[PDB]
């Protein structure tokens, strides 16, 4: 009695086509974006929807990619229409952080450096290590995009983002370039000369190399090619870069905070002035001061109790300047000074782009901002002494209405828009200008440090010209963090069947590795209990790495057409790279020309499967989502609306039929 080799824990027919999908790294959750541009998160068990993240003003309405952090504690997605990018908390469908990028994003890969690396020589103090500022929280609940400063007194957002080892979120697209975002926050490189559209991005665990798969178009067809770029600065100076990305993010977060604080005083003071002013009898004069039903609504009580309204407003704005803005300015100068102590060590730090000079200038501009702020505080004192001058002599005039130099102040005030202007002002703009060039230089230096490349072209054909959404799942890139390699999975079409190939290179660019190229023909499918054997002609509809040693595959039987025609197959690498006859599967050609142009050169291993595979039952299946950790997986269909979720460690409870 026979059980086909996987067990199905859930099946749904989704209301919207699924445009992209990815499993969590550590958990039984899966993430999907549909064509409504909403991001769905689902549980394994009976493919239950955990939450929906629909679009709005700060999202886009069109999402291209999704990337989990290696934690799985943070999901990221890309908005193509509004050209921005969101960092989603897992436990709730809200934007934990977000930022714009220049042009649309077609690919993302979010990496993290080894634990062995995280270890810290201590050049720093509780504040210096910390990634983000925590300062008195901002009364405006409009945080705009990212709620960090606005959310009240939660360390947790900051701890979640920054209390972790260096992690880098790599971005790619058709725009001509690739960016690298430390911590998922600050941009520490931009690489150019990237031709066409990015299909796939993989940055190494050890930061020795970045691999790229890219599609270019001679207008009849398209060519797809693999690239391995060298990231040498990232390797040799890890720790300086991690330290300087920590201080750089922090600094940019301050810039944001002192912006918001400044915004904050301005809107509050604006609205109190408005509500006061137009609250406001035929006789012409503005200055009556030297209308008695002045006193039949607003009274000797009313005067006092407009009074506290206003000195309180004023108190909000000083307290705001000192406690919020000035102390942000202060922290700025502490990280600045530490940064100049970095750039003091000439040889260590600046192959990475910190001018001692630029930092020095930034610091002087900050000082001028603090000082222009201290200068602002007594524009406030004097405005106050006038207003409350006015108030007090007026009070007496109101109860003298029953039974000096700042009388001139009273007149001046009535003529008064005096606080309006005082807040040339924007030193803000110029401070953040100088700082912004300091921050933006390392990005460019490093991106220019990645100029070396390997090129292996893969194939040129019309396969993608027929337009239904491609999902950018394939071809596929995998880093093997234990054996330190790059795997690329791709298909090339021969007999008008797609033949599956596995390419692999050493993470270090100057060194080679066994069996760089090998293809796969699938010979026989059978089980150990039924000795019916399936031997047919199969084409490869998809593939994705399950774990370090295994690859999930989806095949189309060429000959089975209605519902009985597609197969799900686990492929063990230990038998592809099998120690004995691995020597007689060897590439006979050259990487100097395309791979698809020489087929008879590429070694094919005929492999006969008796375990770990299933015919898919009236399924229609096209694409696969592997999870090797939590040992589940998931299969999406031709119509992008139909999913089938398997526990992959278990046989089905359901016995099998065959004719």
Author numbering: 6 to 129, 132 to 287, 294 to 303, 318 to 430, 445 to 457, 473 to 479, 522 to 757
What does the article say, verbatim?
The anaphase-promoting complex/cyclosome (APC/C) is a large multimeric cullin-RING E3 ubiquitin ligase that functions to regulate cell cycle transitions by ubiquitinating specific cell cycle regulatory proteins and targeting them for proteolysis by the ubiquitin-proteasome system. Only four subunits are directly involved in catalyzing protein ubiquitination (the cullin subunit Apc2 and the RING subunit Apc11) and degron recognition [coactivator subunits (either Cdc20 or Cdh1) and Apc10]. The remaining 85% of the APC/C mass corresponds to scaffolding subunits, of which seven are large multiple repeat motif proteins (Apc1 and Apc3–Apc8). Seeking to obtain insights into these structures at atomic resolution and to assist in the interpretation of cryo-EM reconstructions of the APC/C complex, we determined the crystal structures of full-length Apc4 and the N-terminal domain of Apc5 (Apc5N).
We used the Xenopus Apc4 coordinates to determine the full-length human Apc4 structure to a similar resolution by molecular replacement. Apc4 adopts a bi-domain architecture, dominated by a 360-residue seven-bladed WD40 β-propeller domain (Apc4WD40) split by the HBD (Apc4HBD) predominantly composed of four long α-helices. Apc4HBD is inserted between strands C and D of blade 4 of the WD40 domain, extending away from the wider lower surface of the β-propeller such that, together, the HBD and WD40 domain generate an L-shaped molecule. Human and X. laevis Apc4 are also very similar, differing only for residues 120–130 (X. laevis Apc4 numbering) within the shorter WD40 insert that is an α-helix in the X. laevis Apc4 structure in contrast to a predominantly disordered loop structure in human Apc4. C-terminal residues (758–808) of human Apc4 are disordered in both the crystal structure and the EM density map. In the context of the APC/C, due to interactions with Apc5, regions of Apc4 that are disordered in the crystal structures adopt ordered α-helical conformations (α4, α9 and α10). In the EM density map, secondary structural features are well defined, whereas secondary structural elements at the tip and periphery of Apc4HBD that are resolved in the EM density map are disordered in the X-ray structure (α4, α9 and α10). In contrast, whereas the X-ray map shows well-resolved side-chain densities for residues of Apc4WD40, in the EM map, these side chains are poorly defined, particularly for residues of Apc4WD40 at the periphery of the APC/C, for example, blades 5 and 6. In the human Apc4 crystal, Apc4WD40 is secured through lattice contacts with two neighboring molecules (data not shown).
